[PDB]
Ligand binder design. Structure first.
Ligand SMILES: [Fe+3]
Lengths: 319, 336
């Protein structure tokens, strides 16, 4: 699994640009910043731009890491208690812009209007409110047609080196019979809540909600398939024994191949949501302000494909 | 409808940059060039970058034109007699690079394996043996307006057309949807899966091979579109400002569906009357949104003497991996 370790000169250049930008624009609420994102990402060190582009175009790896960023722990400040009510942007603005810059290189930043006030940059930290743990891995929003194409995970801090799980598909473990079956529309994948704590917009998912259609788990090339796998929300008709058998074998190949990948401070982990499932590992949280803190941006390759679920042309928020 | 006029200064920098990249890269066969494209595009004048980014993001206009490029006629040379058997890249390599830089700003360049040997930038000039054809390389026959590859799920999102020369100012026809000209009932019908769109014959899995497991699976989706003949909408996206897919020649309105026939006739009439003649003169680069505009071309008499109208064409996709099932490898930008 390829990775890129920045030089101090690269790390410094990245840090500098990140601060120059964090002072030129007020927030992501500025339309001009979202507009300038690709031009702005072009000022990043060439080696970093080239590394990401090769990852994008190779379409071979489920994840990659850019390591060795300079995240100013003094400036960033303590790990917050909650995301809500908290005024944006904070002192970690520079780090969020970086993740936004990387997103502009892979495609387009987008978010969920009902997820974290619809912030384009997501917070990942321990909260006592939302506090025998099961080890679950998944494709992000596997049911959704407009699910992320990439996930960007930038580690602001991870003092106890708490790993992220990430698993890819090994095709040589599956039979040609199972592969073909998985390519066919024989599986139900349930939606997810995120409700509470415009006629044509909401009535779009009402095909997946009312009718409940069957889709495939593998797609794309049959020699090197993409996948949509969330075992918790996956259903197979009882009478379809071939699909149940093939889904079982797919689960077993993916579960047994799960890797543990640590996003340490200064790392940015890139996950291909079509080639890799991922998950979280349970950990003891301190709540003092020194806890593990990651930021998260969802990337869509095709902004316009989700138009019908978006309030206007301009907004990058779905729902 | 917005356009961007280059200053002679901007046109000079663009030209210089294209010459520079033409010298530094071998051809479009070099995978480093395709990789470098967007970073390279960031070296274009900033105005142009802002203009195109605003077009892309606005998602409102069906077309735009960047006018006033310096296309050196002496360097470019005679309009070729055929695309087959040319040294590649030719002397017009700087212009082809330009359209590829532009496509990287809008999305990713891609091509069709069957089309002109899979060249990502392809030619639009008269070929004598193609005189009676209703195609791009024709001349005498009217190229009637349409959405490009209306049937295809992985059809172009955008089209980039650069005019190397147009001595007789032969216009490209382009038409958009005026939604206010249609009744709310008609729009609702056009939004529903009530229409059959036929594939162009170059897309038929029985036309191109096929034979062996790997290639059969590469046309499995098209094959089941042909076998099942699913009905689909002609208008999609937002009901307040919809995307369209309209190729009159390949559209079948089921005979029994009287509401669909009324709404289709309504939609056709609106688009046909709104048709605009847009002249892509020398140094003009035409951008067409394949989801908001149809396009065609008026008939013209060719000369076949090396002085004929010559355009370069790039197809742009917003999502290269969406068409992965139809591409031989992960790296290839050729469908089929
Ligand atoms: Fe997740």
């Amino acid at each position: 699994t390829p990775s890129y370790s920045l030089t101090p000169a690269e790390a410094s250049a990245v840090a500098e640009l990140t601060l120059e930008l964090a002072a030129a624009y007020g927030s992501f609420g500025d339309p001009v910043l979202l507009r300038d994102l690709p031009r702005l990402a072009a000022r990043l060190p060439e080696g970093v731009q080239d590394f990401l582009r090769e990852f994008k175009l190779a379409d071979r790896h489920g994840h990659t890491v850019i390591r060795g960023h300079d995240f100013d722990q003094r400036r960033i400040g303590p790990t917050p208690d909650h995301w809500r009510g908290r005024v944006r942007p904070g002192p970690e603005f520079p780090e969020e812009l970086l993740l936004m810059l990387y997103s502009a290189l892979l495609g387009e930043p987008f978010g969920w209007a009902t997820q974290q006030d619809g912030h384009l940059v997501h917070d990942i930290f321990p909260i006592r409110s939302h506090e025998k743990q099961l080890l679950t891995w998944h494709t992000e929003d596997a049911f959704h047609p407009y699910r992320s194409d990439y996930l960007i995970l930038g580690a602001l801090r991870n003092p106890d080196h708490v790993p992220t799980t990430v698993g890819e598909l090994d095709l040589s473990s599956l039979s040609a019979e199972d592969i073909d079956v998985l390519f066919e529309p024989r599986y139900h994948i349930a939606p997810d809540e995120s409700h509470l704590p415009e006629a044509a917009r909401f009535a779009t998912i009402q095909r997946m909600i009312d009718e409940r259609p069957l889709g495939p788990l593998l797609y794309g090339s049959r020699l090197d398939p993409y996948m949509r796998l969330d075992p918790y929300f996956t259903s197979v008709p009882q009478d379809d024994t071939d699909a149940r058998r093939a889904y079982d074998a797919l689960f077993k190949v993916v579960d047994s191949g799960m890797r543990e990948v640590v996003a340490d401070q200064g790392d940015v982990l890139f996950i291909d949501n079509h080639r890799a499932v991922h998950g979280r590992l349970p950990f003891q949280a301190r709540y003092d302000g020194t806890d593990r803190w990651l930021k998260r941006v969802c990337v869509t390759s095709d902004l316009r494909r989700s138009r019908e679920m978006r309030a206007t042309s301009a907004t990058r928020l779905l729902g």
